[PDB]
Amino acid sequence: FRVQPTESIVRFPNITNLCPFDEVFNATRFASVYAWNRKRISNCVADYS
Amino acid sequence: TQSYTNSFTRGVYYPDKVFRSSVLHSTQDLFLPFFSNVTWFHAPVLPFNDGVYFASTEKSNIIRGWIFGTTLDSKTQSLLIVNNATNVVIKVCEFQFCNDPFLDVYYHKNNKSWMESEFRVYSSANNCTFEYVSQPFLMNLREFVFKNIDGYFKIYSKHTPINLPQGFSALEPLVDLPIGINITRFQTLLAAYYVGYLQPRTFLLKYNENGTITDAVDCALDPLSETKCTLKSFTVEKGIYQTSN
Amino acid sequence: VLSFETVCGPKKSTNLVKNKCVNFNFNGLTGTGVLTESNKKFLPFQQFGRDIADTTDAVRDPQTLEILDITPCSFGGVSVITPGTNTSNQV
Ligand SMILES: *[C@@H]1O[C@H](CO)[C@@H](O)[C@H](O)[C@H]1NC(C)=O
Ligand SMILES: *[C@@H]1O[C@H](CO)[C@@H](O)[C@H](O)[C@H]1NC(C)=O
Ligand SMILES: *[C@@H]1O[C@H](CO)[C@@H](O)[C@H](O)[C@H]1NC(C)=O
Ligand SMILES: *[C@@H]1O[C@H](CO)[C@@H](O)[C@H](O)[C@H]1NC(C)=O
Ligand SMILES: *[C@@H]1O[C@H](CO)[C@@H](O)[C@H](O)[C@H]1NC(C)=O
Ligand SMILES: *[C@@H]1O[C@H](CO)[C@@H](O)[C@H](O)[C@H]1NC(C)=O
Ligand SMILES: *[C@@H]1O[C@H](CO)[C@@H](O)[C@H](O)[C@H]1NC(C)=O
Helix, strand or coil: CECCCCCECCECCCCCCECCHHHHHCCCCCCCCCCCCCCCCCCCECCCC | CCCEEECCCCCEECCCCCCCCCCEEEEEEEECCCCCEEEEECCCCECCCCCEEEEEECCCCCCCCEEEECCCCCCCCCEEEEECCCCEEEECCCCCCCCCCCCCCCCCCCCCCCCCCCCCCCCCCCCCCCEEEECCCCCCEEEEEEEEECCEEEEEEEEECCCCCCCCCEEEEEEEECCCCCCCEEEECCCCEEEECCEEEEEEEEECCCCCEEEEEECCCCHHHHHHHHHCCCCCCCCCCCCCC | CCCCCCCCCCCCCCCCCCCCEEEEEECCEEEEEEEEECCCCCCCCCCCCECCCCCECEEECCCCCCEEEEECCCECCCCCCCCCCCCCCCC
């Protein structure tokens, strides 16, 4: 005899330190192609959606 | 100055994040050997082999900061740790030139005890990756153990008031910063140093009911300790016991 | 252009259920068991718990500051008590 599971749950810590993808995309003024900006996005949760 | 002193059961830290109550656990990790000899440093680059144990005591805040790296040149990335009065900055950024550490001609505290806004040791701040800011590391005796295992740099700390004194004090984890750099040398900075080096030993920690380490035994010091580790107990009864080969 | 080469996508969560045999996943600590509150006191930095037989006993959920035990939901064998089949048929 064995009691089968009734549900499956997954717990992870709060989401915070979301990457600055918001800042990159909504720049008021971009630069010309010859001098293109670059941002090393590191150590953050991406959330590409 | 390299005067030597023995470490009386100092340099014990929590190996894992798990919790154990009223049970003896045997673990095989890097540790400072019991009754090993340490080196006092006074007013040189250390070899930093397989971890380090840092300890210092003073009534002032003269001691602050550390620098780590394998070459201290532009070829390889270098690491910095510096504590402010109210914050700490930990940026792994390359540093090229170091003409001389700052040192006032007088450096007399009998008349003037103000030394502020005089920190410039990095000649060039080249491209780098990581930067962490948190609560001050320092606040009594301060004990720190620095490790670099599997790309993770781990820092442990503990504040033990004194009257390396005898006793047992467990080092709790503080900040596991993920630099990823290779570290082969380290050096301390100024505004009484205890330096010890770890070896791949095996220990037998004793966990309290609340979950804190109270006692530990090194399984490679004397045959009695080997017998204790084999029996997994701190009290051995009368008899003959086989320990090793 | 987002070139690719610590940076990992957000992992969503699920509501906490107690007193039922539920599959759980606490920061990659997969297992099965019942979830009940515990009168233990972990250290501030500890997250898991482990008994003498190296089996997860208590786990702290990453979101709220609470610690709960992990007990396997009931299992075991079954037996049938019957007289002689000629004597009767009830079991
Ligand atoms: C180890 O420490 C002792 C002091 O207890 C000292 O005499 C000895 O020289 C040290 N070992 C080495 C290799 O210097
Ligand atoms: C901490 O000290 C560094 C050293 O230059 C300084 O750049 C930084 O601004 C200080 N932190 C704060 C919060 O002022
Ligand atoms: C950072 O600077 C070093 C020093 O020249 C260089 O070799 C490296 O390509 C630069 N970029 C990265 C991502 O390390
Ligand atoms: C560190 O050392 C390892 C092997 O000793 C080597 O593969 C690696 O390239 C070195 N540098 C870094 C940044 O890991
Ligand atoms: C465990 O913690 C409780 C609550 O702080 C305390 O009363 C008890 O003395 C502790 N046990 C020790 C220190 O062995
Ligand atoms: C996550 O968010 C909840 C919202 O109620 C909060 O209670 C909890 O403290 C947060 N996580 C942390 C930092 O414990
Ligand atoms: C059950 O009991 C009856 C009466 O005692 C007997 O006749 C019969 O043979 C028994 N059944 C078997 C399988 O022996």
